[PDB]
């Protein structure tokens, strides 16, 4: 696949963008979970994928029963790591444009975390989509963070909701969806 459009796709507590505590996510927001695997899973294409890429640290968070992600091509980024295709849905790279010479048959593709892999990437002109959930708490600083994303948003512009809703077709996009004491909303961000 030669410079396709890429799409970070996250969930952050506003206002600092706090996404991660000890190597964990500092929430458990079940309907936003069934959107990530509806929005990086669906495709419009006939015999197409998508495919997620991640840092091998989130690989490794993943207990091994759970891996790979299932329905679409998991790419997993290591310094150390060859380019080589392990399997039909595994690859290993080192980087994110050379893990990309090794697939076909992919429609979309998301960079899944983490947080290493987010700071660093958001500075690849690849990248033209950001997908973030923007989480609201009563007293955020109650929240316990130690990761945040570093991000450079005054480079980018939040879409309308009419734009978002394109991106991901038919799936049901409510508005500020609550879970305990968190309301969240979807975002669409592109370059300006
Ligand atoms: N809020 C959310 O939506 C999400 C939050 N997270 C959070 O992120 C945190 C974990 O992040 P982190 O520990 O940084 O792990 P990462 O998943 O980002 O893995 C970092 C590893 O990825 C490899 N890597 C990083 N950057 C590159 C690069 N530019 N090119 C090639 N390889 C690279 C390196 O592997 P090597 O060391 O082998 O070279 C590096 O050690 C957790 O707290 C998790 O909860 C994760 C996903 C989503
Ligand atoms: C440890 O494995 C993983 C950890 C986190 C992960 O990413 C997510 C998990 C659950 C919900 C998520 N929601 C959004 N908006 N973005 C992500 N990247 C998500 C995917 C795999």
Do not use: C
Request: glycine share 4%.
């Amino acid at each position: 696949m030669l410079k396709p459009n890429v799409a970070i796709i996250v969930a952050a507590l506003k206002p600092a963008l706090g996404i991660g505590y000890k190597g964990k996510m500092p929430w458990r927001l079940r309907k936003e979970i069934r959107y990530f695997k509806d929005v990086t899973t669906r495709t419009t294409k006939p015999n197409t994928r998508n495919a997620v890429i991640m840092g091998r640290k989130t690989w490794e968070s993943i207990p091994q029963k759970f891996r790979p992600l299932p329905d679409r091509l998991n790419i997993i980024l290591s310094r150390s790591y060859e380019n080589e295709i392990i399997d039909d849905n595994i690859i290993h790279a080192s980087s994110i444009e050379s893990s990309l010479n090794l697939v076909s048959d992919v429609e979309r593709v998301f960079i899944i975390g983490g947080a290493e892999i987010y700071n660093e990437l958001i500075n690849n002109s690849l990248v033209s989509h950001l997908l973030i959930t923007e989480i609201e708490h009563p007293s955020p600083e109650s929240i316990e963070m130690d990761t945040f994303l570093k991000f450079p948003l005054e480079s980018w512009t939040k879409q309308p909701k009419s734009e978002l809703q394109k991106f991901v077709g038919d799936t049901v996009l409510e508005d500020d969806i609550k879970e305990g004491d968190f309301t969240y909303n979807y975002t669409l961000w592109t370059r300006k």
